[PDB]
Design a protein around this ligand. Structure first.
Ligand SMILES: [Zn+2]
Ligand SMILES: [Zn+2]
Ligand SMILES: [Zn+2]
Ligand SMILES: [Zn+2]
Lengths: 246, 396, 396, 396, 133
């Protein structure tokens, strides 16, 4: 509406997002460049100390891209909105300016968010695998507005004790995960090598999941239980447990 | 054709008017027309070439609109417009070249290239806007069948012909009476020669006539008529009519007598000029009749009387002449002229890409052959290619 | 240059469109552009210099805006607009004159006058609007390094030269073989003469060749080629090559034989025309090679045989000719032509104010000297002055 | 062109800077530019090579990005980057080869290949970054029409020419006076020979002149001038001017007298050096005029007197020589030179894939013909292909 | 000399790197150096002398800073930068020419022209950066 363009008739399932179409269909450099960034600002994958990490574009980390955002929406504040009623147009442009005039605060907020993310991600010990989950965390855009319009200039970083506690919890969870995998694999392999054909590996997998401490085993689908059994079967036994079994 | 011309005109206007620092009020309507062009051309695939050495080129259109708000145009706006205009201009040039190299005996006025045929669809009519050029204006008028008028400076209406007619002749070619002419471009030089100087002619007058039939009717024509034909007034060795031998011509120039220039339409005298030289007007004609007389001077000085004896040998041959130059005219059909470059453009495009000789035009687009046999199909194809050439000239 | 052209264009539009009784909607955009020009020029002091006899003139701009209140323009509005437009037109004409009379060897394309140099500042970019003239179009294309094109009717590409070459000669000049040519403007007339009429030639054929090198590349050229060269077809008394004596030429015109007109680019044959006369097209060339032959007529009537004996004296000298006129063409560089008045305007401005000879152009603005040594510096300066001359001619 | 250069520069910087163990701060900007290149190229389909034996190749981009938060690069990071770098280098090399084998007469400066034409789109402009090479800098300045020059070590400005001129000669070629020269690359060796040793010449001085016209203006040129021509200082048997017979040359070298070298621009004396040998500077010139003299030694020892008798036969032929070597220079146009490999790269690419001869360059990319007819269109195409060749040599 | 070389180097880097479409990360330090040069040169009057036929030229510096806040450089940015760069390049070329035509028997290693002597003051030392030639 700002550029007098016909409203997009977007088709669901299109391999392009609406912003990807708008980037090609919009000629203004400010808005087009901001759209290009928003289109291509996915996580980057990098292995640090053997841990896979999802890292941000350097322009997010330093907060510079917010300027581009400002640029883009500053242009939106100067646009005619050809056929829009003038009072609604004024309200939209004044909201755009409400966000625009907080350029310094938004750059500071972006840098703070990126720094906090990096510092807390340094404490992650398991690979940060990006998968579209079944359920989501619902984020209210009103909360985003609150964060954008109420952030000041008070830097808040994780406390060293908070970082150490987070790292300790992650290490404990990872170590327990590996140790319970080892126990389950050892027991399954012993049962198979002892020719205990009436043994149910389902009970072993249930005990393993229960010892992982974060699963309500009653709500685990059966196909996933059997897939877990198969994958546990395919693993080799840990050296200490295997020697004891020998 | 109107859609192609409108594309070219919109691109020319965008090049000329979309410049850094100009007020947006100077381009608002132009920007809307440009956006309409973009919308209409978006999502369409075109192919040009595939004939002669002209390369196959594929064109896809996915461009955004110019919707930025400004008081004065800046560098960003001009660069975006420049990119879009460059792509569109390349497409239009290729389409014009593709259409300029094609011809058909049937429906030669209709589009021949696939790109122009697709552009002739209804969905592209939205691209159409101002059609002010002479050639597109004439195209639209002819489609409406109103009188169309192409104004030519020195129209190329006479096919080249340096010829002669011997009304009296003999194998020795020493006592000849006849006419020799050059009809080239907009110029007609004619010269009637009598070797005997009308010594035995009735009343000592010899009459010469030269009829030139124009292939198309010319109107509102300005003509310069001069008594003498400088081309046929020097000693010359001319081949025989069948080329068997050569004869000698040794002119002595006498002023033409009883000069009558008649401009005829359908055999009827539209204009007549008697003993009038300089600038004359032929308002509507398809034929020129130049009648002039070699009159033996009744009184001669001894030097003059020495040139014209009573009998052979005749060493000096009495020649009268006429020069007729069409400075400007108007024709309902397209023609080559000294001021325009459409014939040159079409010929260059056909020669550069080695277009094979087609079934309509003569080889190399030789203008003499084309205008010697200016058939209606040839006229239609020539008008099509000339309009396309002008459209291309707006950009290239 | 773009700002100066835009000033002139705005003034021309104001003169043409601000007329009594006209609807304001006919001038709204024009009035906005004119007021933008007024705003941009206000508060600026300009000076047009005293080079030559041009008076030193100081220009101050303190004008109010044109009104926007009348539904139809009345007499008072037209009078006020006329006053402002007269002052602005005087300023623009003086700036154009001051620019035309200046030249530079280092940067001839850049502005030379201080007023135009000031107008090249960014603060004046607002004045810039529609650039639709051919010369300004080519200026803008040249600045971007794009294919420029100037269309010339009868381009003045050949420097004047009436010369002859004697391939066979002797002190008494009674047995001469050679060529005499005139190269002037768009016209070439060449004539090869043999006094023996190729009696002792290897096959009774005498070969003549004329090479004319164009100082610039010409494209899309319409060219009339005629057999005879009327300029070298009458008796003449011609100075010797060293001026020590005078010799006699008594042409008798024979039909040129094996006429080959080659249009060459970089020494390669771009176009070739054998025995073709009338209108031809040279699509891209920088050199012309006219090869023709004097062929002794194998069969001669008694008079023709009488003209050409087997040995000296040779009283009649066989001559073959060729005329080559460039009716129209396209050149990437600026040139003087029969239609445009740029050279005339620049020369008139320079002569009126007694401009001292500079280090670039010949000391008369003489075209033969300019085109003979058409250097890149000369080309840059000539393009600049011609563009300014067109800008001035829009108003004056 | 700028986008292709930026791709090549990004790939070169990725090879150089993305190394194991390097601080991320050493590559942060480089990694950002590399990711921008990946993002821009992703999802785009390219086709290269349909001319000569250059095979058709199709290129698709679906590559991943590179990390941005690690402190030091490790072997995993480099391994991740290397496959993408290899594919992109292959794509860029093929695009450069495709563009190097193409030419056009209309717009030789504009891209010719389909891949480079697509890269001219606005969306790829984001890939553009530091244009610091000499050729790309000249490209960008020349597009803006700014004064920019290429610096050449031993510029290849003189087309090969080993010729002689005889001012005094006769059928037996025993008493000759004239000059023999070799023009090759940056070298001019000229030798004026007199068989009579100026015995009868006025003041016993024989003057020799040699004019060499450079096809392009050389500026800020260092020249080594030596007073002998070793090439023309030993006995030779030389064909006649028409190849009908061979004559004998038996030089005896006398030092040149009154040596004057005039470096001229547009017929104006820019630099003049008299009796100066060693290093000289020619700041701006297009013509070299070497004037030298053979002076008889007024006093001769018995052997020297025996060499030069008062009359024929002349068995020892006096000779004076000059050697001129352009060590370095600056030219606004691209030239082959002893230091760069641009001409070698273009010729190699054209030969390896059997590119058919086009309408711009001479067959085989012959440099002598190319510099003999160095037209503006040839200059445009040569600059384009040389810039592409430098871009390719950045990676290959 | 180091200040003059740094001016020329900054201008060459600006001409090579400030191009349409380039990421600002490719020019951030260059833009900082360019703005430092503008700040240091603003308000200073220079004169390149009239030795021989070299014209007397006067140079005044009042230029705005090059902008930040762009993710990719656009055409407006490049145009403004080109205007400033053109003026600065003309100034630097004239200063170099003025210094090239002068000489002194003693202290000939020191600057000779007034412009370079002014540039040798402490206040212009801020312009100095990478000396790699
Ligand atoms: Zn005319
Ligand atoms: Zn006959
Ligand atoms: Zn003579
Ligand atoms: Zn010889």
């Amino acid at each position: 509406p700002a550029f007098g363009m016909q409203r997009m008739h977007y088709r669901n399932g299109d391999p392009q997002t609406p912003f990807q179409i708008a980037e090609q269909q919009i000629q203004n450099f400010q808005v087009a460049n901001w759209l290009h960034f928003v289109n291509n600002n996915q996580f980057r994958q990098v292995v640090i100390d053997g841990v896979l990490n999802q890292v941000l574009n350097d322009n997010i980390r330093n907060g510079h891209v917010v300027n581009q955002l400002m640029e883009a929406l500053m242009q939106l504040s100067r646009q005619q909105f050809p056929t829009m009623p003038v009072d609604y147009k004024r309200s939209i442009q004044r909201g755009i300016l409400l966000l625009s005039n907080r350029l310094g605060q938004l750059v500071d907020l972006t840098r703070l968010l990126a720094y906090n993310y990096e510092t807390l991600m340094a404490c992650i010990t398991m690979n940060m695998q990006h998968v579209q989950t079944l359920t989501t965390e619902k984020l209210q855009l009103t909360s985003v507005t609150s964060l954008c319009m109420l952030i000041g200039n008070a830097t808040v970083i994780p406390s060293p004790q908070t970082l150490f506690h987070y790292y300790n919890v992650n290490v404990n969870f990872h170590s327990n995960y590996n140790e319970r995998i080892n126990d389950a694999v050892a027991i399954i392999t012993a049962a198979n090598r002892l020719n205990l054909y009436q043994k149910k590996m389902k009970s072993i997998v249930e005990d393993f999941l229960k010892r992982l401490q974060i699963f309500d085993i009653s709500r685990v689908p059966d196909d996933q239980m059997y897939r877990l059994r198969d994958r546990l079967r395919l693993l080799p036994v840990e050296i200490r447990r295997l020697d004891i079994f020998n | 054709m109107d859609v192609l011309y409108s594309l070219s005109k919109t691109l020319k206007d965008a090049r000329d008017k979309i410049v850094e620092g100009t007020l947006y009020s100077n381009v608002s309507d132009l920007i809307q027309q440009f956006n309409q062009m973009i919308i209409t051309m978006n999502g369409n695939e075109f192919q040009t070439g595939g004939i002669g050495n002209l390369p196959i080129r594929n064109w896809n259109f996915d461009f955004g609109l110019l919707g930025t708000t400004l008081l004065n145009l800046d560098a960003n706006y001009v660069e975006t417009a420049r990119n879009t205009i460059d792509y569109f201009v390349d497409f239009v040039d290729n389409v014009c070249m593709d259409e300029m190299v094609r011809e058909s005996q049937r429906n030669g006025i209709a589009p021949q290239s696939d790109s122009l045929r697709k552009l002739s669809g209804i969905k592209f009519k939205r691209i159409n806007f101002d059609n002010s050029s002479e050639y597109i204006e004439n195209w639209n008028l002819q489609n409406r069948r109103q009188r169309t008028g192409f104004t030519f400076h020195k129209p190329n209406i006479f096919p080249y012909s340096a010829s002669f007619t011997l009304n009296r002749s003999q194998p020795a070619h020493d006592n000849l009476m006849g006419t020799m002419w050059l009809n080239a471009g907009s110029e007609i030089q004619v010269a009637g020669f009598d070797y005997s100087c009308a010594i035995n002619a009735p009343a000592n007058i010899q009459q010469f006539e030269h009829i030139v039939q124009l292939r198309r009717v010319l109107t509102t024509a300005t003509i310069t008529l001069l008594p003498d034909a400088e081309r046929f007034s020097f000693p010359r060795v001319i081949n025989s009519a069948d080329g068997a031998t050569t004869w000698y011509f040794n002119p002595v120039i006498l002023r033409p007598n009883n000069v009558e220039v008649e401009f005829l339409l359908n055999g009827q005298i539209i204009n007549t000029y008697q003993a009038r030289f300089g600038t004359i007007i032929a308002r509507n004609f398809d034929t020129i009749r130049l009648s002039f007389q070699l009159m033996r001077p009744p009184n001669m000085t001894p030097a003059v009387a020495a040139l014209f004896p009573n009998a052979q040998p005749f060493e000096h041959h009495a020649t009268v002449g006429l020069t007729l130059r069409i400075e400007s005219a108007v024709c309902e059909s397209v023609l080559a002229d000294a001021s325009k470059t459409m014939l040159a453009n079409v010929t260059s495009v056909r020669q550069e890409y080695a277009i094979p000789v087609g079934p309509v035009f003569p080889p190399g687009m030789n203008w003499t052959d084309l205008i010697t046999n200016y058939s209606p199909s040839r006229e239609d194809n020539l008008q099509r290619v000339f309009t396309v050439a002008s459209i291309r000239s707006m950009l290239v």
